[PDB]
Design a protein around this ligand. Structure first.
Ligand code: CLA
Ligand code: CLA
Ligand code: CLA
Ligand code: PL9
Ligand code: LMG
Ligand code: LMG
Ligand code: SQD
Ligand code: LHG
Ligand code: LHG
Ligand code: HEC
Ligand code: BCR
Ligand code: STE
Ligand code: OEY
Ligand code: CL
Ligand code: CL
Ligand code: FE2
Lengths: 334, 244, 153, 137, 36, 176, 30, 97, 33, 51, 32, 51
């Protein structure tokens, strides 16, 4: 009944409506700080000189944006990768002009999200579960690290991190393609397959289980009332589902082990999104998508264009226009 | 003792002009048969004042203080030029080259950002006649050029520019163009500013001088899109004189 | 004038936008008069032809060609290595029929102004004040009907 | 279209004599250009000074004219500025400076001819692409 | 600004030490099956 | 060729700005989320139904019993995320619903683009930016990108139109 | 009026979060 | 009243010849013997009242005065345009390839 | 910003009309139990 | 010529009546520019009521 | 006529909000 | 100017209307300057006063 032991029992209690835990001790303050600053900035922050060229970009609602165009703007290119907390600025006005809020938000968020992953391990341990849900979450978490931390590190500037906004995200995407040809990179191709395939299998599994629900209600009520929370018996006939799907393709292309099936459902999108996070993370070091520009030439040496060369034309257009005032020299090396 | 780069880096000392000891109250004699150059002129602003608009009748608003938001990026340095002796014994400094401009933006009360090109480009500064000695009462008065804050290649956020860019508001294809002509046609301003440099310290042995300055010039007009503001700048300066 | 008004991209139903609402008059305005047919010529008197905007393009450059498709003048983006400016080529515009019939303009900014309109086809005088028209093309009832019925189908 | 002797025929000197390369020489010169030159001159531009390219019309107007085999072989031995006024061996790869540009050490006299021939043949095949830069990619 | 800096340094230190000492307070034993 | 189709749709239709595509994005990414989170949850709330360390062997397709604990899964997610599924039927129907609905929404948006009925612009942004050359958003930044794409890919991508764009008309920022 | 509208809708969603978590219908076993 | 001064300049001899008072230095590559040595001298010693003035540049050898004399018909002079000579733009106007 | 004025009424009814429908259905369910 | 009461300000005068006179953006309702009101600005009072 | 633009939304909500309140009360009275 | 501005009936609070909404500036406008005190005289030079 010691005072520290009583605190410890409350932090790790499985009776709290929301589990706190030791990871939560860090997660709760960092997420609140990031959230509060983000909301305030999104509504009211003044324009930010993201590219360090004294050309401020207006990101907030009160400065003429709507929900789709608004953003918390990345910090000034003049700052690069330098740490820029509030107490390094001569004034909040300076700190706002240079994009200080973006740094505060992304650092608090990445910390709080990392602790979110730890919290998933921790409660699983307090409830006597198996531990690997947090491993599923490492795929979206790694993706957030890639566009908020890793890519700025390799390019030398948080000004090239992804903006906290909807149109800013598309800006990040378009510029990424012009400089890395991400579409032609196999790890992004694997990410598409993980995301397309994940949507596919989500719909498959949902439709197969729904298709084989055991009749338990009348036509005047939701079939959902045929399941009661915590009932011991399964609510659908997996052998009927297997019998349908195995005939739709062929027998051995259909699961009849539910554990194997759900593991497959877990693994496919998780691994696909690991690869696409790794794609951003390695294009951060400028190992770019396949280049087949002028790869086909004829007997004389005329270039014979392919669809890759058409892609390059579009990429060139994005290259020459992006940050139209920020380049003084012919090569955009970062 | 002189510091190294690794002693300075990240401190903010790189933006500060060299200073003289308070005991440097000497005089630097000027031999007219000799020619002289300024080997280094350094100007460090400390205060940015903007004139307000009084809107009503003959009121003439005052200079209000502002906050700097572009950090320790403000000083003019490594400026050099000829220091001539005129037939009346006045000295004339003629700027030749140097890091003689810095873009600065300060923020007025209420949130308005005022960008300006702090500069002494093409400075010609002259003393009173009959100098013969640079002393702690010597003043230089001069004028300089303030070119457009952006140069001709600069593209506004809709792709318009002077030496490059669209000539119209391409996103409003059938808008009446007469209302947009001020935003559609970029022009390049070239105005003048005035500066006083007051010598307060003189090292008669080394030819270093230091003191106070005040300049008045125009702010950015965004290539003719809006009216500039009047800006007053105060600070400290340092110069080194050598026999040419 | 009715025939000339058909030869104008502002009445093309593929030039609108999903959330650009209301009648077409709210965009380019209420059409008042055909200004006349614009004829462009360079300093040596060749007739030049403005390249017309295709429906795919929200914006389009101003490129003037001869009868054989050879580019002879344009409005340049980068000025410093321009070879085909209206200023260098002495491009003029003359009008036949319509309101401006028998008038010629030679000052380069007026000539370019009509050249920007000519990528839309025939040139019209619009009232933009009555409806406070915003200058952006909207689609016709043909476009809206087609959209709604393909989506319902 | 094919690599015919007519396209493989390039000026030898300013006097107007011509030489006809073999396909082999052309392919050899292309390999050697990639090995020793392309890091700056890919596609006939000059990355470190884009004002000067390898287009034939540019080379024709250099002093010593460089639109011929001789002029190009001489340039690889003793490069000069475009007006001929100064020797630039210490900032530009050449045989005269192969001590500081080690990739030039093992180039023989016939390698120079092939490299020169590649530079002169390529605009005949690629047209505006050679030395035009990204506009023509 | 200095006050702000000091305050944040104290607040962060506080939360980090809670984390470290929390996981050092017999965390393996806090599970529903086997405590040791 | 499909990659070229994506980029065409960005530069010409501003398709990323279209709310029907955004609803499709949410359905595809929401479906992939649901797929991963559901698979992982089942696999980490399994009942111990055998002694092997490989837990796959401890399932039998004709068993009546649920192979994982819905009750423990619900408690976990309620305490981790605030809310959790409690109805196995709703959950699997929702997995049908989310990606199917998303794809249907994107199809509606493409039907609009058949007519060039784009959500290309915000009129209010354009009016302000035309009048006020200091006003810049990520929205205006992206349209400049779209304009580069069009002018630079159109001649080679639409060869039947015989677009000749002299160098001086191509939109370009400084140096690049 | 449009800023007010965006913020209003956003605030309603946050309030809905609160009720959906703390005033949910409690899951009851079997 | 509002005119683009650079477009207006394209309507003068600046639009057809090398303007010794305005044109960027890379244009001197169009004629032989001019780049870079004489181009450097010409730009540094601008402005000129007349094309013939370039022959009075101090230091010219007789071969350099010969080169200029052959090229005088490709030169012009117009009034200095601030927008074309500020920013160091006669040495680098942001155009590469 | 020069926004469409009817945007406000359109937004308000878009929220209000279907939300009210759901609230009506929910409250009369509760008073059955 | 344009004081608060011409502008339909209703609560602004009640903050000003008891001593809240300046804004975090540097203006005061008495005309002085370049003032620093500390936390208890118009903005600080509002934020305090929201919390 | 140059009427007040907010008069439409004011009138609209004046009707909708109290009307919906009554309808809610009435329908739940009927279902019990 | 502040004193003259008080001597103007547009700042009299008993001059309004129940459904004339918004700031006072929405009515007579945003005051920019005192035009000066008007003095009226007839042909005989006598000073006249507006009721
Ligand atoms: C087939 C149906 C149809 C068609 C083609 C038209 C066509 C037209 N009408 Mg008419 N109208 C219709 C039905 C129709 N109307 C009906 C039913 C009404 C009564 C409400 C009206 C009332 C009406 C008025 C009052 C006016 C028009 C006007 C017009 C013109 C301009 C339309 C415009 O700007 O659209 C704008 C269209 C949009 C912004 C698209 C809205 C679609 C939204 C985005 C879909 C919502 C998506 C949904 C919520 C997603 C959720 C799904 C998910 C949960 C699963 C045009 C010729 C105008 C005109 O010019 O008149 C002279 C005008 O003032 N119409
Ligand atoms: C976060 C990024 C992201 C995400 C998640 C999506 C998601 C989506 N995009 Mg969008 N896209 C994005 C970014 C993104 N996009 C960007 C940045 C752009 C640039 C503007 C685009 C441009 C874009 C375009 C241009 C289009 C989409 C479309 C789509 C949808 C495709 C749905 C689908 O599965 O089609 C997959 C195709 C099918 C499901 C068709 C049926 C396929 C049959 C069943 C296949 C049978 C295969 C056969 C049996 C075997 C073949 C084997 C052979 C290979 C050997 C989906 C909603 C499409 C859309 O909206 O559709 C309406 C579309 O046309 N996107
Ligand atoms: C003590 C209350 C009070 C007072 C004195 C004011 C005073 C003011 N406000 Mg403020 N306001 C208040 C409360 C108040 N407000 C509240 C609670 C809100 C939140 C909604 C606001 C929101 C607000 C905004 C958004 C704005 C103002 C503005 C203003 C100014 C102009 C007001 C105007 O035009 O009135 C108009 C008043 C009327 C037309 C009177 C309406 C009364 C009708 C008749 C309803 C009663 C009928 C009823 C149904 C009868 C039923 C009978 C039944 C028994 C049978 C003024 C300084 C304006 C301003 O200039 O701000 C800068 C402005 O834009 N106020
Ligand atoms: C001149 C002339 C005459 C010319 C001659 C030409 C000529 C003669 C023509 C005539 C042609 C001819 C005669 C006809 C025969 C041709 C014929 C053989 C055609 C072949 C056609 C063909 C291409 C078919 C396409 C096959 C196709 C693409 C399928 C491949 C299989 C495939 C992709 C399967 C995916 C399966 C997968 C990995 C997972 C499923 C997803 C999954 C996890 C679901 C979830 C799930 C699964 C369960 O399992 C259960 C249980 C439950 C619960 C559950 O949640
Ligand atoms: C019952 C309650 C209704 C509330 C529901 C929410 C309100 C509806 C919200 C949707 C409409 C909002 C659109 C904004 C329009 C507006 O603000 O401007 C209002 C515009 C009117 O346009 C006005 O016109 C005026 C002159 O007539 C002036 O030009 C104004 O400037 C212009 O705004 O409204 C419309 O044009 C109404 C059109 C309605 C029918 C069009 C639909 C046809 C296509 C159907 C597509 C099917 C898609 C199915 C999806 C699955
Ligand atoms: C609950 C949800 C909403 C419920 C229904 C809400 C609608 C109610 C409408 C009430 C009247 C609306 C006013 C007309 C609309 C209008 O344009 O106003 C709009 C006006 C503002 O006025 C606008 O101002 C703008 C600049 O801000 C511009 O000047 C515009 O021209 C002007 O319209 O709204 C207000 O002033 C808010 C009114 C609140 C103040 C009331 C103070 C009086 C209190 C007396 C109460 C007595 C009641 C006793 C009865 C017994
Ligand atoms: C030069 C040649 C080089 C050759 C190199 C070969 C490369 C292959 C390396 C990988 C090795 C294969 C490991 C698979 C074994 C396994 O996972 O067991 C786990 C279970 C056990 O199966 C289950 O097995 C059970 C018995 S037991 O567990 O196996 O003992 C049984 O009960 C159950 O019914 C049965 O389904 O397997 C399954 O359930 C099938 C799911 C398939 C899992 C693949 C992951 C998909 C990710 C791809 C991501 C791309 C998307 C973008
Ligand atoms: C670049 C290669 C990619 C790395 C491979 C990692 C695959 C791991 C799957 C992650 C999904 C995480 C969600 C939690 C999922 C979770 O809860 O899973 C649980 C599931 C079964 O749990 P068991 O306790 O039965 O697992 C057995 C282990 O405990 C040891 O027996 O794990 C496995 O099946 C692991 C199989 C990996 C063995 C083969 C490696 C995978 C090969 C196929 C893919 C190859 C790459 C192509
Ligand atoms: C430490 C803090 C943890 C993080 C805090 C998270 C708070 C937010 C959680 C969501 C609460 C709202 C869900 C309401 C709805 C609700 O209460 O759902 C409750 C419902 C419970 O389902 P049952 O299976 O109990 O119901 C079955 C039957 O009752 C059906 O009749 O859950 C689901 O349906 C899960 C899938 C919906 C979950 C998707 C919602 C994701 C929310 C994200 C949307 C955000 C938009 C952001 C815009 C800015
Ligand atoms: C970068 C390190 C280079 C390498 C490798 C090569 N070249 Fe080069 N080249 C370079 C520069 C910076 C310049 C301009 C030099 C100057 O100031 O004048 C050049 C120029 C040439 C030229 C002349 C072009 C003309 O007159 O129009 C030629 C013919 C040339 N270079 C050839 C050449 C060859 C054959 C190379 C491989 C052996 C090679 N260069 C490499 C920069 C660089
Ligand atoms: C119409 C009208 C009227 C009426 C009106 C009214 C009555 C109004 C009201 C209004 C109101 C009454 C409003 C309210 C508001 C509120 C708000 C807006 C709030 C907010 C809050 C928040 C947001 C918070 C948050 C939080 C939490 C929750 C927790 C923690 C902490 C914090 C702070 C974060 C009258 C009679 C005048 C007449 C005329 C007309
Ligand atoms: C930061 C610059 C100003 C310094 C802050 C002053 C301290 C804050 C005083 C605020 C007034 C509080 C008194 C109001 C009544 C207090 C008792 C109560 O009602 O709870
Ligand atoms: O892509 Mn292009 O590269 Ca990476 O930097 Mn150089 O320009 Mn700029 O800062 Mn944002 O962006
Ligand atoms: Cl950009
Ligand atoms: Cl650069
Ligand atoms: Fe399942």
């Amino acid at each position: 009944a010691n005072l520290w032991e009583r605190f410890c029992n409350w932090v790790t209690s499985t009776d709290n409506r929301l589990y706190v835990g030791w990871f939560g001790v860090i997660m709760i303050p960092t997420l609140l700080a990031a959230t509060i600053c983000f909301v305030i900035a999104f509504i009211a922050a003044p324009p930010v000189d993201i590219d360090g060229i004294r050309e401020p970009v207006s990101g907030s609602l009160l400065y003429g944006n709507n929900i789709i165009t608004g953003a918390v703007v990345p910090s000034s290119n003049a700052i690069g990768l330098h740490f820029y907390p509030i107490w390094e600025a001569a004034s909040l006005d300076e700190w706002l002009y240079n994009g200080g809020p973006y740094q505060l938000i992304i650092f608090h968020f990445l910390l709080g999200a990392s602790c979110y992953m730890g919290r998933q391990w921790e409660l699983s341990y307090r409830l006597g579960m198996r531990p690997w849900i947090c491993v599923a979450y490492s795929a979206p978490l790694a993706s957030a690290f890639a566009v908020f931390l890793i890519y700025p590190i390799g390019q030398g500037s948080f000004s090239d991190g992804m903006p906290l906004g909807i149109s800013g995200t598309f800006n990040f995407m378009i510029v990424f393609q012009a400089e890395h040809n991400i579409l032609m990179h196999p790890f992004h191709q694997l990410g598409v397959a993980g995301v397309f395939g994940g949507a596919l299998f989500c719909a498959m599994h949902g439709s197969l289980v729904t298709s084989s629900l055991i009749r338990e209600t009348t036509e005047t009520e939701s079939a959902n009332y045929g399941y009661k929370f915590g009932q011991e018996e399964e609510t659908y006939n997996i052998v009927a589902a297997h019998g349908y799907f195995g005939r739709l393709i062929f027998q051995y292309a259909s699961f009849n082990n539910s554990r194997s099936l759900h593991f497959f459902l877990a693994a496919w999108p998780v691994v696909g999104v690991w690869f696409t996070a790794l794609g951003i993370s390695t294009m951060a070091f400028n190992l770019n998508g396949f280049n087949f520009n002028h790869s086909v030439i004829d007997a004389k040496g005329n270039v014979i264009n392919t669809w890759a060369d058409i892609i390059n034309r579009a990429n060139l257009g994005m290259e020459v226009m992006h940050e139209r005032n920020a380049h003084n020299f012919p090569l955009d090396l970062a | 003792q002189t510091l190294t780069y690794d002693d300075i880096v990240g401190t903010g000392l790189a933006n500060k002009c060299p200073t003289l000891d308070d005991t440097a109250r000497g005089a630097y004699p000027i031999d007219s048969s000799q020619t002289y150059r300024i080997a280094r002129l350094c100007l460090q602003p400390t205060t940015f004042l903007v004139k307000e608009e009084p809107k009503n009748k003959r009121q003439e608003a005052e200079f209000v203080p502002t906050k700097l938001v572009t950090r320790e990026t403000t000083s003019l340095d490594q400026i050099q030029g000829e220091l001539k002796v005129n037939s009346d014994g006045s000295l004339t400094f003629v700027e030749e080259d140097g890091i003689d401009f810095q873009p600065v933006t300060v923020q007025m009360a209420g949130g308005e950002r005022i960008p300006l090109l702090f500069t002494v480009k093409n400075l010609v500064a002259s003393t009173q006649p009959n100098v013969t000695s640079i002393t702690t009462s010597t003043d230089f008065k001069g004028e300089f050029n303030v070119p457009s804050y952006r140069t001709a290649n600069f593209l506004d956020p809709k792709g318009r520019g002077l030496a490059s860019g669209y000539d119209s508001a391409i996103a409003l294809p059938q808008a009446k163009e007469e209302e947009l002509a001020r935003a559609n046609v970029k022009r390049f301003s070239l105005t003048k500013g005035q500066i006083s440099l007051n010598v307060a310290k003189v090292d008669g042995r080394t030819g270093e001088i230091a003191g106070t300055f005040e300049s008045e010039q125009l702010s950015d007009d965004d290539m003719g899109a809006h009216e500039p503001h009047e800006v007053k700048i105060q600070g400290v300066f340092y110069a080194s004189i050598e026999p040419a | 004038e009715k025939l000339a008004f058909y030869d104008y991209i502002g009445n093309n139903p593929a030039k609108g936008g999903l959330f650009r609402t209301g009648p077409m008059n709210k965009g380019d305005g209420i059409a008042q008069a055909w200004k006349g047919h614009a004829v462009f010529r360079n300093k040596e008197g060749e007739e030049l032809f403005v390249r017309r905007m295709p429906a795919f393009f929200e914006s389009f450059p101003v490129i003037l060609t001869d009868k054989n498709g050879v580019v002879k003048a344009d409005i340049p983006f980068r000025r410093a290595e321009s070879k085909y400016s209206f200023e260098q080529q002495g491009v003029t515009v003359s009008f036949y029929g319509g309101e401006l019939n028998g008038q010629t303009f030679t000052d380069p900014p007026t000539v370019k102004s009509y050249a920007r309109k000519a990528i839309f086809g025939e040139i019209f005088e619009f009232d933009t004040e009555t409806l406070n028209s915003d200058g952006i093309f909207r689609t016709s009832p043909r476009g809206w009907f087609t959209f709604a019925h393909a989506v319902f189908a | 279209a094919e690599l015919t002797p007519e396209v493989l025929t390039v000026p030898l000197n300013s006097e107007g004599k011509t030489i006809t390369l073999t396909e082999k020489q052309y392919l050899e010169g292309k390999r050697l250009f990639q090995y020793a030159c392309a890091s700056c001159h890919v596609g006939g531009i000059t990355k470190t000074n884009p004002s000067l390219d390898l287009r034939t019309e540019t080379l024709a107007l250099a002093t010593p004219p460089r639109d011929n085999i001789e002029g190009l072989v001489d340039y690889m031995k003793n490069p000069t500025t475009y007006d001929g006024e100064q020797e630039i061996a210490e900032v530009h790869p050449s045989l005269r400076s192969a001590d500081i540009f080690p990739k030039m050490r093992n180039l023989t006299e016939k390698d120079l001819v092939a490299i020169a021939g590649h530079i002169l043949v390529e605009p005949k095949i690629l047209g505006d692409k050679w030395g035009g830069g990204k506009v023509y990619y | 600004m200095e006050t702000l800096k000091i305050t944040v340094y104290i607040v962060v230190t506080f939360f980090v030490l809670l984390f470290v000492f929390g996981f050092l307070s017999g965390d393996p034993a806090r599970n529903p099956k086997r405590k040791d | 060729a499909i990659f070229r189709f994506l980029l065409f749709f960005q530069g010409f239709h501003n398709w990323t700005l279209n709310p029907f595509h955004m609803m499709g994005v949410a359905g595809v990414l929401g479906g992939a989320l649901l797929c991963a989170i559901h698979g992982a949850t089942v696999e980490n709330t399994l009942f111990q139904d055998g002694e092997g360390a490989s837990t796959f062997r401890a399932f039998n397709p004709t068993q009546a019993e649920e192979t994982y604990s819905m009750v423990t899964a619900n408690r976990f997610w309620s305490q981790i995320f605030g809310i959790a599924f409690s109805n196995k039927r709703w959950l699997h129907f929702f997995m049908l619903f989310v990606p199917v609905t998303g794809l249907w929404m994107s199809a509606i948006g493409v039907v609009g683009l058949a007519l060039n009925l784009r959500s290309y612009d915000f009129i209010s942004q354009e009016i302000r930016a035309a009048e006020d050359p200091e006003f810049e958003t990520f929205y205006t930044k992206n349209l400049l990108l779209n304009e580069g794409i069009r002018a630079w890919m159109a001649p080679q991508d639409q060869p039947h139109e015989n677009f000749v764009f002299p160098e001086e008309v191509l939109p370009r920022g400084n140096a690049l | 009026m449009e800023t007010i509208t965006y913020v209003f809708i956003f605030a309603c969603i946050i309030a809905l979060f609160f009720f959906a978590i703390f005033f949910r219908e409690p899951p009851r076993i079997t | 009243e509002l005119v683009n001064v650079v477009d207006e300049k394209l309507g003068t001899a600046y639009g057809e010849k090398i303007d010794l008072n305005n044109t960027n230095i890379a244009a001197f590559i169009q004629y032989r013997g001019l780049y870079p040595t004489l181009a450097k001298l010409i730009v540094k010693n601008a402005p000129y009242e007349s094309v013939e003035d370039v022959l009075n540049i101090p230091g010219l050898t007789e071969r350099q005065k010969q080169i200029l004399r052959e090229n005088l018909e490709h030169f012009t002079v117009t009034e200095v345009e601030t927008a074309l000579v500020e920013g160091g733009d006669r040495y680098n106007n942001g155009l590469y390839k | 910003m020069e926004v469409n004025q009817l945007g406000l009424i359109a937004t308000a009814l878009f929220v209000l009309v279907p939300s009210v429908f759901l609230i009506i259905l929910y409250v009369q369910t509760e008073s059955q139990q | 010529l344009n004081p608060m009461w011409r502008q339909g300000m209703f609560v602004l005068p009640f903050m000003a009546r008891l001593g809240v006179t300046g804004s975090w953006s540097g203006w005061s309702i008495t005309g002085e520019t370049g003032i620093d009101p500390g936390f208890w600005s118009f903005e600080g009072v509002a934020l305090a009521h929201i919390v």
